[PDB]
Amino acid sequence: AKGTNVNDKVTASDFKLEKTAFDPNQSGNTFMAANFKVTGQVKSGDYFTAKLPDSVTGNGDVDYSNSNNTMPIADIKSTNGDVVAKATYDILTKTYTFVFTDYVNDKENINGQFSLPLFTDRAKAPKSGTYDANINIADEMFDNKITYNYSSPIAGIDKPNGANISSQIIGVDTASGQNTYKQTVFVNPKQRVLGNTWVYIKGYQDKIEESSGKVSATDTKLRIFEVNDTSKLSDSYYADPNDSNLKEVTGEFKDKISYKYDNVASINFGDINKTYVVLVEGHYDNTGKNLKTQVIQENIDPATGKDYSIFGWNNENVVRYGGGSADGDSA
Amino acid sequence: GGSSGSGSNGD
Ligand SMILES: [Mg+2]
Ligand SMILES: [Mg+2]
């Protein structure tokens, strides 16, 4: 029974970010860690909170939309095993709520510590740069400066007509059992002149038997957006379908998409000129093995006819973990 | 041995 907010009775101490700068596009993240003391006593149901700013998240590329935007967090326990608090995280409000167990009833003067992984907010920190990241714990603000150095999505063969494609898995549902994923593909970020262009989306890289991903007309939904100003796309791979910079052309690709070949989707872009965003809504099996994907783009020269080029891009994500402990007095 | 992400599962 979630009851009373006792932020006024808890105080945080020794706050440090594990590191202040990283690359979210190369599995970069960090941790917030701190001690806390409960001046006074509490009981089963009392709770305290931590709150994340716009710049960061607490779930990262793991999606919890099909799970009521609530992600469970590892129990906070004593030395001798018993749970001292149950912890939860709200994605939408970026709120950590630690609610005490009955363990704390017959206890007094509770001290503890936690370590929680922090990731980027691809939507709200869409560009590489230095952001403000002031974390709140127990009605107390801790100022930090965070710095995201994204590996640019603008990548490809180094000829004026060379294939160039990038992608990123920015959402993965591991909790629901629905097993879904959201991936953003950047087709032609160099926006160079390309001829007879083809794009392939695989959910397996080199070995099918090694990536859980599944691509077919059933498990995969695709949306395609003509970009107006490539100068305004995110470095974080986040893409807003309702951005005016994007124009959905999905209705123009009816007879240009194929799921015939195993675990791959073909997209006949043809003679293109601009950058295109492809929103991918896919699924992965219950084989328990990892989700590994690959996007491949190939093209000729519009002016020549020869001058072939092909380019591949691998994706995979890593899981981090939270940790916490606490204790009081056995009387 | 390219782009990769990171996230949390809580459990
Ligand atoms: Mg306080
Ligand atoms: Mg297939």
In a domain, A309, yes or no: yes
> CA–CA separation, A9 vs A29, rounded Å?
31
> CA–CA separation, A207 vs A101, rounded Å?
47
Smallest CA–CA separation between B4 and chain A, in Å? 5
Please report which helix (H) or strand (E) contains residue A248, including its range.
strand A246-248
Residues A134 and A168 in one domain: no
Distance of CA A105 from the midpoint of ligand 2 (Å): 57
Residues A142 and A182 in one domain: no
In a domain, A167, yes or no: yes
> CA–CA separation, B11 vs B8, rounded Å?
8
Give the pairing of strands A309-320 and B3-8: parallel
> CA–CA separation, A263 vs A68, rounded Å?
30
Nearest-5° Cα angle at A28, A23 to A33: 125
Residues A181 and A112 in one domain: no
CA A227 from centroid of its chain's CA atoms: 23
| CB–CB contact A151 B3 (8 Å) | yes
Which residue range forms the structural domain that includes residue A228? 152-322
Residues A43 and A183 in one domain: no
CATH classification of the domain holding A180:
2.60.40.1290
Contacts of A60 in chain B (CB under 8 A): 5-8
Helices marked H in A220-317: none
CATH classification of the domain holding A92:
2.60.40.1280
Smallest CA–CA separation between B11 and chain A, in Å? 6
Of A91, A116, A151, which marks where a domain is finished?
A151
In a domain, A175, yes or no: yes
For A72, nearest residue in chain B (alpha carbons):
B10
CA atoms within 13 A on the CB side of A237: 33
A-B contacts at Cβ under 8 angstroms: 80
Residue for token pair 């782009």: B3
Determine the longest span between alpha carbons in chain B, in angstroms.
28
Could you give the number of structural domains in chain A?
A: 2
Residues A91 and A200 in one domain: no
CA of A261, nearest ligand number = 2
CA A191 from centroid of its chain's CA atoms: 26
> CA–CA separation, A153 vs A156, rounded Å?
9
Residues A27 and A109 in one domain: yes
Tokens of A49: 């909170």
| CB–CB contact B6 A71 (8 Å) | no
Residues A216 and A253 in one domain: yes
Tokens of A256: 């240009």
Of A111, A131, A151, which marks where a domain is finished?
A151
- Number of other residues whose CB lies within 10 A of the CB of residue A69: 14
Residues A23 and A125 in one domain: yes
Contacts of B2 in chain A (CB under 8 A): 313-314
Distance of CA A31 from the midpoint of ligand 1 (Å): 21
Give the per-residue SS3 of A81-136: CCEEEEEEEECCCCEEEEEECHHHCCCCCCEEEEEEEEEECCCCCCCCEEEECCEE
What are the φ and ψ backbone dihedral angles of A230, each rounded to 5 degrees? -60, -25
Query: Method used for this model?
Result: X-ray
Residues A92-97: contacts with CB under 8 Å, at least 24 apart:
A93/A51, A94/A51, A94/A52, A94/A53, A94/A56, A94/A57, A94/A58, A95/A49, A95/A50, A95/A51, A95/A52, A96/A49, A96/A50, A96/A51, A96/A52, A96/A58, A97/A2, A97/A47, A97/A48, A97/A49
Residues A166 and A146 in one domain: no
Q: Which of A148, A61, A288 is nearest to B8 (CA)?
A: A61
Among A96, A164, A296, A321, the strongest candidate for a mutation testing the B interface, having the largest count of B CBs within 10 A, is A321
For B7, nearest residue in chain A (alpha carbons):
A60
Option in B2, B5, B11 nearest A60 (CB): B5
Tokens of B5: 């992400």
In a domain, A330, yes or no: no
In a domain, A327, yes or no: no
CA of A220, nearest ligand number = 2
Residues A13 and A94 in one domain: yes
Q: Which of A329, A318, A304 is nearest to A23 (CA)?
A: A318
In a domain, A182, yes or no: yes
Residue for token pair 């951005």: A243
Helices marked H in chain A: none
Residue for token pair 């990731």: A119
Given in angstroms, what resolution was this structure solved at? 2.5
| CB–CB contact B7 A172 (8 Å) | yes
In a domain, A171, yes or no: yes
Of A117, A151, A185, which marks where a domain is finished?
A151
Residues A97 and A146 in one domain: yes
In a domain, A104, yes or no: yes
Residues A274 and A213 in one domain: yes
